Design a protein around this ligand. Sequence first.
Ligand code: ADP
Ligand code: ADP
Lengths: 74, 524, 136
Amino acid sequence: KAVRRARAGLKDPKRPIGSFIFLGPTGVGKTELARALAESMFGDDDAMIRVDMSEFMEKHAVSRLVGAPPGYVG
Amino acid sequence: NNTPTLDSLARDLTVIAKDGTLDPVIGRDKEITRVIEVLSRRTKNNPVLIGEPGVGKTAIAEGLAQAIVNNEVPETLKDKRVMSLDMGTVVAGTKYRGEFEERLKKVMEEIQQAGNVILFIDELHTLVDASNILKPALARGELQCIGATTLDEYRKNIEKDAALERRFQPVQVDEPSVVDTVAILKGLRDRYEAHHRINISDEAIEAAVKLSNRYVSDRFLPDKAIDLIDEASSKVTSLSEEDIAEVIAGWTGIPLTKINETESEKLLSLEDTLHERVIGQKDAVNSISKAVRRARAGLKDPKRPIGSFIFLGPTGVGKTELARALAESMFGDDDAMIRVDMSEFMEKHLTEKVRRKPYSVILFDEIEKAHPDVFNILLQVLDDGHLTTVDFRNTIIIMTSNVRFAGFGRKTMLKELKNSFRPEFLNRVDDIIVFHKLTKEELKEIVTMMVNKLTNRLSEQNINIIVTDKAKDKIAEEGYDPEYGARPLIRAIQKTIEDNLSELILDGNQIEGKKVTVDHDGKE
Amino acid sequence: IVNNEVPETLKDKRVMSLDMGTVVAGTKYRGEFEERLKKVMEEIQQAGNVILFIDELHTLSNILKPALARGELQCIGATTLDEYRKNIEKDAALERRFQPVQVDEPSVVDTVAILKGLRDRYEAHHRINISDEAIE
Ligand SMILES: Nc1ncnc2c1ncn2[C@@H]1O[C@H](COP(=O)(O)OP(=O)(O)O)[C@@H](O)[C@H]1O
Ligand SMILES: Nc1ncnc2c1ncn2[C@@H]1O[C@H](COP(=O)(O)OP(=O)(O)O)[C@@H](O)[C@H]1O
């Protein structure tokens, strides 16, 4: 419904197409469903942008998302 | 009519096209058409051919020159010259004011007054000093350019200045497939036969393509295959795969018999070539040979790695030398082993190595000590087969490991692995291998190996070392430890030989080929 | 070449060595050097049989391009890896035309063999005998 609402031109221009939390047990399909969506949109699983939050265990890991402040390395 | 300075320092491509000497350009019709439509623009009509080195970027400009001569271009281009301007000595006086801009403006005004030049500028990124001279002429439309650069150079230089992006349009040039490279070679065949006066078989073409794709990673098709077939037909009635393999042996140093052996005969002889390098560990060698045969039988998903093995045994008793034997046998060199450094995973709080060497054994030294981020990378390699692209399907993954009774007082390690690692990851290793604590006779056969590797090495100094088996036998004590064995022996061979002979012949005597016959004195 | 040991496919090739000092020697004005270069390149194009040797090649693409364009100047040269890493690798128009040949560091044995050959004319210059074992 979100994908169709986007391509139909009804999506609010200022907001992303959709944002979803997939909550459930381990090994139930909720990463595979994202992979299948990416495949259906781009023909390949590899076009997904995958962020592994387990490495972001510290607050300063946030620099990997948005960069290092002026004067800091990288 | 004429452009006297430009004609001195630019290779005229369209005249070489009319002179028939230019080689054919095959299959690049999409890229040529994209260049045509970019050139027809009114404003930013300057294509940049973006692609890896050697993929055919200049061949697009030469195909354009052919299209112009062959009247295939639209009428807007029917008469334009294509001039490959070389930067090499457009810089010539790096200190003086204006000496660069002098001859640059001279070339540019010649190109202006002869308003029918298309200029090809290879390594365009090297211009970004000149940009302030080109921007006004480009804006004025007098000069029309084809650039060529790598993608990373483009991002590093041209993308950063919006005023350059406001003048140049990117055209992606990709490395052709094996099929396209074959079609290229089959076109160029006749033109190379006319030079070498040798027949070139189709099987030699496909062999050259395959072997350039499998033994020369750091270079790209078609240039690899062209270079290979050219140097082979130089080395040579007709060309054949044996000459291709000989040239690959030249470029790699790999022995020719290792190169031209089939997959099957390679993996059949495998475990003998393992046994003779490692000594002992019969169960481990049989396990790894069984597992790799099972993988290469070809039923497994061809995107997944060839193997994934955990080594449990004590210390250094044979793990690393078995990994090096596996890399030597499966892929052709000890240099086919990559030792991963775990610091890369800590550093955020390998990929560019695999890019260079995809036929390699990947060794994880003591995976227990790694950052637990390593398991994300491991799982990603072991399930998808690719990272960022870099592809692991040809690699073998080896992960090494080393996993008091307060009282009056061969299966435990299989237990303790389960709880010492993430079991969801142990669900995905292909096999688990246990190394035994080696026997004394195996250890002294190692000593016969190392003493031979010293004797023949010393023999390069004309020092014909000779040794008595019983003397080596009675150094088998000199490093037998419950913790380790294949290491302390290395601190025995130099004391028992090198320093022993440093007392016995190097001083107070003199080195001669006779008493370097080590006779057993009854003790050592 | 002079032994005619080279392939029968190129016995006619003549090897010659170009020194910039000689080419500038006695030039009296600017551009005379460059035009003497251009006319010797034209003579090279007419002859077709030449092969040109250029030591200290790193002293050199464009000014000799008119005969590197198609490769009318068949070229052989020597350089150190230092004076190769920094320049000859760093011009695509050279990497399109040159091929590096590494000349190996020789063994002790080969160096004493070449010595005990070439020794005979240094004996001549000194009028002294060289012990072959003192060489080794
Ligand atoms: N409902 C399902 N349909 C199809 N395949 C599934 C389903 N649930 C799990 N799987 C399979 O098992 C794996 C499930 O991974 P997944 O459950 O997406 O990881 P997680 O949910 O723990 O992030 C995938 O390889 C997928 O093929
Ligand atoms: N379509 C093609 N037809 C014939 N030869 C080609 C083709 N594409 C590339 N080549 C060959 O590849 C070699 C390298 O050319 P190129 O990749 O343009 O060099 P560069 O690294 O400057 O881009 C040349 O010898 C060229 O003839």
